[PDB]
Design a protein around this ligand. Structure first.
Ligand SMILES: Nc1nc2c(ncn2[C@@H]2O[C@H](COP(=O)(O)OP(=O)(O)CP(=O)(O)O)[C@@H](O)[C@H]2O)c(=O)[nH]1
Lengths: 392, 82, 205, 61, 85
RNA sequence: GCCCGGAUAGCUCAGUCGGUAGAGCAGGGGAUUGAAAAUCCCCGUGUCCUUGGUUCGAUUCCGAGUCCGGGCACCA
RNA sequence: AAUUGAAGAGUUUGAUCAUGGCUCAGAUUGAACGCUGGCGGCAGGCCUAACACAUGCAAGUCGAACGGUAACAGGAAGAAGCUUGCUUCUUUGCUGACGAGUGGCGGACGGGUGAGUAAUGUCUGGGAAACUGCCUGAUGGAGGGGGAUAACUACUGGAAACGGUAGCUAAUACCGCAUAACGUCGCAAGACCAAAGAGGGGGACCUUCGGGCCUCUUGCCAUCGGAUGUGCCCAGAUGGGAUUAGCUAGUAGGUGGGGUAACGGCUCACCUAGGCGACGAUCCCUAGCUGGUCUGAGAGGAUGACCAGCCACACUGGAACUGAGACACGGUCCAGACUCCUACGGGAGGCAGCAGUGGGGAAUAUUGCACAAUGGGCGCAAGCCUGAUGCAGCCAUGCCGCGUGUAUGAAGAAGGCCUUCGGGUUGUAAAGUACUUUCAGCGGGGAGGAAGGGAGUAAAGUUAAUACCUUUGCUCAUUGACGUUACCCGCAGAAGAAGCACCGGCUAACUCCGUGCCAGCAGCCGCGGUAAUACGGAGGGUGCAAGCGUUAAUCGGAAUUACUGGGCGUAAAGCGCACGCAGGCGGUUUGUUAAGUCAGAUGUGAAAUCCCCGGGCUCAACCUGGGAACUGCAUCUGAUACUGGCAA
């Protein structure tokens, strides 16, 4: 299908990051609400963005819900991620598509170690922009306390390379704006105009060989199988053959459908974050984590040597050193693979907070490239963070 | 309702037309009364190009056979004098 | 389609000369013939009746280079013809174009003759023919196009048949790599030693 | 009851397979086999000769 | 079903109302005769017959009765009245 | 995507509710019978699936994955 | 010219001959799976769940039937800015055209599936108690009026779907009157029965200035035909089980009435007591059928996917309506079940149409392009609609064609393998070398499928008419979805293009190493319990080839269901014996019948498929011309020896 997409504004990927119960989902409903009162059509609510019985029962997010809008500047794509400890895997899948992350900070608690992980995962997935919206501003009056809270958000981003001291921390109330307030809507509209100023239209390399990260799979009843993901590189159009590359025995299919949230786009260029239709592929064969590439230019790379910044208990890693043979999870922004920690002669056991480099052998092959920044999670804690130096 | 039309037989990209006498309510290759002659559109120039058993055709005209203009085009092609 | 392998090993298996490596030198003689079809060519075989029926089947195919599915269709055509099947089958196997071209000096070897037809060089009645299995009707002709004419290979290969017998059912001009065909071959005119009799029994079952 | 061919299999009480006809005439009441190269009952270890049956692929190395 | 050919549906409905009316008036005059024949009114049955003649034949000419059915309605019923009279 | 039961000597499996891994069959020897089976007698040959800790010591308590079986939720 | 057509082997036993099963060699397939993988041509592609299905499309057209015009482009009056005719632009159905509606026509065609049905069906051949829109031949008519309704307005219900009330107006919508005949009814007499008009052109005449009036085209009404399709009847044929032997009472027939287009238990009222059954009725199970396809020497057996014919079905069950025709796939209503929407009162939907999805499963495709050709619908026509169809995509699925190269090359090498370590083999194979370049790949040329149609043009029919319409030539611009086409040219370079099964006997083709009745092999008999031509590997060889194998299924071999063409003293088997009904068969003669039989003829046996002789794609498969055949059935005319009937 309904209403073919009309090429009007350059695409932008954005969305929420942060601590549990911090109004990330309410802000998501509130942002487009103020924007529904400015331009276009939107303003979904609490009942719509939250879809599961589990979610609307305990006020949580188990699946990364997506919403779309566009200011008079650019075209936008909002990614609503969870904030719960066991749902960190979900927000990382959302982190693989966002051109610019947006931290949702409640005025009460502020900078948390859990909020610290939502930030650290942003640098290890490639995102450079974070506009922090202080939510619950209508609940605080004691500014001396709140100004000390805001500066701790900036230096924590500054700890993790995000220029927080240069970052405009947006202050406002999302509750009133979602219900129709003329006062705090501008507070919401603060981040909106800064979204058109702090986060511009990046390098959209549409002239490269096609490659696309698999976010999730949505089988359309009547159409077939639609995989989801933003175009990492290259271009696609209905009438172009691709492949199913990654974990299992790699197969083939054809690009036969691209939708920008119901809007039919003929040619989905680089940066376009949509759902991609697969021809003759079942639900079972394709899976979460693989990648769609050009017909045969990405082999199933298995082993690679990486430069890894090992964290400490103070930096989010383990609290006790771990020997040769450690089996953690490796987030390739969507590809959670367990791998062997091949320690170099000189590091018998990994102390909390080391500056080392190890060789990793994957248990499931995938597309690999030198310079791939990937974080390391185990036991709820992101135990490490590395970047690929050598691909074997 | 009787009619004189073509049949479209042969193969892909190499048509052939059994000029036949059939009921108009059938299909293109369906039920018919009788095939009367034939036609080959790829018959440029050789020993055999087109045949229409004219006398039996004209017999059906008096019966009330509505000739299709394509077939009528062939009758105008294999004329009484031409 | 083609055997495309060691085409002298075939002659050692059947024991008979097949003119596969006819080319320039007259007789092979440098392959330890008749006693070495393979690694254990020292084993004097029993060679039973099914073998003698089958060895005859392979030999004829090995000469003209035909495949089983293709060769069986030649037998299917031979049965429906009038006269005698054993004769008309030898007529169809002879009526092949690459076999006709082989009888004209063009393509000193039967394989080369197949390649010559394969590369549009062979032309009949002003019509280029690529199909080496082109059935030649009686009273026709053959020649070579101006493009691939006397291309350093046709000359040398033509010299071979000049030393051969040059059969009755056809006639060569050799003025411009020119040929002319006549009536179809007779059993007594072709090969003079083959026993097609064993072949007819094989395809009966 | 179907005979599992080859030298060495990899089944574990569920392993979905494919059945093909044929008797064994060595086991009482066995009238079927298991297809080596189809579902979960994979190809036999290191077989060069006749690998269509027993499902070994062409060796890359 | 929703189709532009739904006119054929409503037009058949409109045609049926005219058809239900005309077919009913025809049958009453036929039933008028049976009321007469059972009574033995040799003149009245003839009156009813001669009265229903132009209305039963009119239905045959208007594409409703098959112009043989109506003829049969005349024939056998006539065979009754001259048998009585 | 979420929630459960399981991966234990070659095989089949019990044991925990922090105490240094057991049973049947197995395999071999003896006793034995015109021969064999059997029976009795002796023992783990274990990375308790992998990985880190809390700890004097972790199958254990947990936190997290890997694989297997089963169930449920979301529908570009 | 038209079927020139028939193979066996293995296995019981110490050994033989028999009998006799089991198994194999072949061809084939809507094929599936493993392996490998180059192109093209022509075909095929849900046989499993008649399971359920989002979206798009699959059936519309005519203003030359009518009231109208909501829009878009003109014309007109006028208005506005200002380049006062350059623009803006309000009125206006007056032209070009056309939504919404009335009406005519098509929607019953074509496309899909095989659930049901064992006979209400199908095929063959006859037969009469039938009907037939559109097409068409012949004969005639085509007079004159009336009353409504939708659309359109106003109010109003319902969330919507969907209506309701009061007025407006039309016709090729409806309805009388009139008028009727070789039409209907009837013995005749008599009685009664139809309707539609519009459009083009035009000199004169007439203009209440709509138009009348003339001509031309088409249509309307009545009737008899023809042709066509459809409906019905009768006879034969049309699976397995008798461990289903009796079944039926609107059932079998009659008299009268009704009903259908049409005869009739099709339906009634009464009477008669019968009707069917061993030459298989009922009953159960299974199943679409046929021309055909597969195998086969044939006779038969099996099967009947694609093409085509016929039948039935269209969510399940039922009924009826309109209509020439349906008891109707994109029609109505009702009940039910399952989804869907809901303001919860109440509604909407039907992919067994093309695609596609879920799911079932061993397994089967693209949410492609065009209406150019052909055909169908409508229309005067141009055109409008067409998931028919024409192509294209995808899959080696089948069939067929071709390539992956040729010549040369004896150190008769290396490496591998065997060895009597003598050597042989791998092997002219490779290297090297001299040639070539099909199909791919890239850059250029280039058919045919296209006939018509449209405008103008001239002539010819017709006409009062150099007008209009029809017909025949001419010209311009063109109409190709396929399509970066079939084919042709150049280019560089052996360059991108070889696997799979098997090697004991059957059944084409061998040795060694390793495992030791373990691992395993296998179609049949079987091998392996330290020497394997049988297992696993290596070398060589054999067969087949872009395919090779395995599995499943049909036939064959199987003269192991024997009509062609088997047996019964003991191999499996003569009822224990006799009597005898139905049934089958029958000595000899004459005459006759001509039923069986034989010949000849004609009707028919749909076409295609198979066969013979040819033509056209580079050939082939494939398409295709004619012929033969379709082994049969019906009727007539003769023969009448033989069999049967009849008479002695
Ligand atoms: N006073 C106040 N309360 C607010 C404001 N914004 C949100 N709240 C409340 O904060 C709560 C969290 O809402 P939610 O949208 O579930 O958060 P979440 O970020 O999805 C949490 P999870 O991490 O579990 O998925 C709700 O109660 C919301 O109404 C604000 O500006 N002011």
């Amino acid at each position: 299908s309904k209403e073919k997409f009309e090429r009007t504004k350059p695409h932008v990927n954005v969305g929420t990051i942060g601590h549990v119960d911090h109004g990330k989902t309410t802000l998501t409903a509130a942002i487009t609400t103020v924007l529904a009162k400015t331009y276009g059509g939107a303003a979904r609510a609490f009942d719509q963005i939250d879809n599961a019985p589990e979610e609307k029962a305990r006020g949580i997010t188990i699946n990364t819900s997506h919403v779309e809008y566009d200011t008079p500047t650019r075209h936008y794509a909002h990614v609503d991620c969870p904030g719960h400890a066991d749902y960190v895997k979900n927000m990382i899948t959302g982190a693989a598509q966002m051109d610019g992350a947006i931290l949702v900070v409640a005025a009460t608690d502020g900078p948390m170690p859990q909020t610290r992980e939502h930030i650290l995962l942003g640098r290890q997935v490639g995102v450079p922009y974070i506009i922090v919206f202080l939510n619950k501003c209508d609940m605080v009056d004691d500014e001396e306390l709140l100004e000390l809270v805001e500066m701790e958000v900036r230096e924590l981003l500054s700890q993790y390379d995000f220029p927080g001291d240069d970052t405009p921390i947006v202050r406002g109330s999302a509750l009133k704006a979602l219900e129709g307030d003329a006062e705090w809507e501008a507070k919401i509209l603060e981040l909106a105009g800064f979204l058109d100023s702090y986060i511009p239209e990046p390098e959209r390399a549409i002239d490269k060989p096609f490659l696309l990260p698999i976010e999730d799979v949505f089988s359309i009843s009547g159409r077939g199988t639609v995989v989801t993901g933003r175009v990492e590189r290259g271009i696609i159009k209905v009438g172009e053959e691709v492949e199913i590359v990654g974990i299992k025995e790699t197969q083939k299919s054809t690009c036969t459908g691209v939708e920008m949230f119901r809007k039919l786009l003929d040619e989905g260029r680089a940066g376009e974050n949509v759902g991609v239709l697969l021809r003759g592929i079942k639900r079972e064969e394709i899976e979460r984590g693989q990648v769609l590439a050009k017909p045969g230019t990405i082999k199933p790379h298995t082993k690679f040597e990486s430069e890894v910044y090992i964290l400490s208990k103070d930096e989010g890693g383990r609290h006790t050193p771990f020997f040769k043979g450690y089996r953690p999870q490796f987030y390739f922004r969507t590809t959670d693979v367990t791998g062997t920690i091949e320690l170099p002669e000189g590091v018998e056991m990994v102390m909390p907070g080391d500056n080392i480099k190890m060789v990793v052998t994957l248990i499931h092959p995938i597309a690999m490239d030198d310079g791939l920044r990937f974080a390391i999670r185990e036991g709820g804690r992101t135990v490490g963070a590395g970047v690929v130096a050598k691909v074997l | 309702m009787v009619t004189i039309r073509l049949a479209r037989h042969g193969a892909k990209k190499r048509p052939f037309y059994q000029v036949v006498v059939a009921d108009s309510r059938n299909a293109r290759n369906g039920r018919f009364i009788e095939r009367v002659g034939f036609f080959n559109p790829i018959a440029s120039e050789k020993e055999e190009g087109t045949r229409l058993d004219l006398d039996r055709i004209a017999h059906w005209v008096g019966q009330g056979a509505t000739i299709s203009d394509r077939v009528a085009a062939l009758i105008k092609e294999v004329n009484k004098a031409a | 389609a083609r055997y495309l392998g060691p085409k002298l090993k075939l002659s050692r298996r059947e024991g008979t000369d097949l003119f596969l490596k006819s080319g320039v030198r007259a007789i092979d003689t440098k392959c330890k013939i008749e006693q070495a079809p393979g690694q254990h060519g020292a084993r004097k075989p029993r060679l039973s009746d099914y073998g003698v029926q089958l060895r005859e089947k392979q030999k004829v195919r090995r000469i003209y280079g035909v495949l089983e599915r293709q060769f069986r269709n030649y037998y299917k055509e031979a049965a429906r013809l009038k006269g005698n099947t054993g004769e008309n089958l030898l007529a169809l196997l002879e009526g092949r174009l690459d076999n006709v071209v082989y009888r004209m000096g063009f393509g000193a070897t039967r394989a080369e003759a197949r390649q010559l037809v394969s590369h549009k060089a062979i032309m009949v009645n002003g019509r280029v023919v690529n199909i080496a299995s082109y059935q030649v009707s009686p009273n026709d002709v053959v020649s070579i196009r101006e493009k691939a004419k006397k291309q350093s290979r046709v000359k040398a290969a033509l010299e071979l048949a000049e030393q051969r017998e040059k059969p009755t059912w056809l006639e060569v001009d050799a003025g411009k790599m020119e040929g002319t065909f006549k009536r179809k071959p007779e059993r007594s005119d072709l090969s003079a030693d083959i026993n097609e009799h064993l072949i007819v029994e094989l395809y009966s079952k | 009851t179907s005979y599992i061919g080859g030298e060495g299999h990899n089944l574990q009480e569920h392993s979905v397979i494919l059945i093909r006809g044929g008797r064994v005439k060595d086991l009482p009441g066995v009238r079927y086999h298991t297809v080596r190269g189809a579902l979960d009952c994979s190809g036999v270890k290191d077989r060069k000769q006749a690998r269509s049956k027993y499902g070994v692929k062409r060796p890359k190395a | 079903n929703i189709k532009s050919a739904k006119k054929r549906a409503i037009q058949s409905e409109k045609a049926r109302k005219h058809n239900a009316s005309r077919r009913s008036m025809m049958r009453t005059f036929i039933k008028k005769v049976y009321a007469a024949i059972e009574a033995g009114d040799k003149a009245a049955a003839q009156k009813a017959f001669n009265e229903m003649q132009p209305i039963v034949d009119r239905q045959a000419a208007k594409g409703l009765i098959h112009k043989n059915k109506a003829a049969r309605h005349k024939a056998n019923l006539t065979a009754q009245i001259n048998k009585l009279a």
